[PDB]
Homo-oligomer: A and B are copies of this chain.
Amino acid sequence: SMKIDVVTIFPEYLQPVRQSLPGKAIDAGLVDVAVHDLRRWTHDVHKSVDDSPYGGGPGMVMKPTVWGDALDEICTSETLLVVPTPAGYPFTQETAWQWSTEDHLVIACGRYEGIDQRVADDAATRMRVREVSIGDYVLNGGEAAALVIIEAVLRLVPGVMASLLEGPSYTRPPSWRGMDVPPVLLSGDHAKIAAWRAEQSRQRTIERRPDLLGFDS
């Protein structure tokens, strides 16, 4: 089994849905996903979770006190704390394979301006902490990135991307709107099909992701 805790100020957005890969995983008892409203650990009347940044700048920064109290209750020393952020280490397929063997992931969802850095620094004295980016784009907060990470990881768990791009794929019918499936794919010749698909893959990779083959992007 695996336990995933997600902490967010948008709990409804992160509520697991039965008809989904994570929903299936949950139902098969392979993972338990629990979502927590960050505001549960506030004490003030207007349940404030953020404040203006020291040093100036646009936006707000999430308060360390509230996150501190939440992670105190949810995490143990065995927890792998995941914090989505544009500023993080890259989250890759390798990362997904690695986290697929973890007993307990806690995903801290915060606005992109950041959670006060002292939260992650403090947590790091007790547990493993991974600040990660799923890609080079900005979201308002970590929530969508958490859903991506959960998807990528849960499909790898026992019971539930190489280094090239997969080429085009086809299915029936063999002709459609005047466009024909590549005759080699209909030929039954596994060796020539494998050769064709290898070529297509390399051709697609050169065009769309030349960086994967060690060329200028």
Contact = CB atoms under 8 A, between A and B. Distances in A.
A182 B117 CA distance: 11
Interface stretch (A26-34, A74-82, A185-193): A185-193
B64 A171 contact: yes
B144 A161 contact: no
Contacts of A158: none
Given A51-B171, A54-B174, A116-B176, 11 more contacts: A12-B18, A51-B172, A53-B169, A54-B186, A56-B190, A56-B193, A61-B171, A118-B176, A122-B177, A139-B148, A140-B151
A131 B53 CA distance: 38
A195 B143 CA distance: 31
Contact of A53 (B18, B60, B171, B208): B171
Contact of A10 (B20, B51, B182): B20
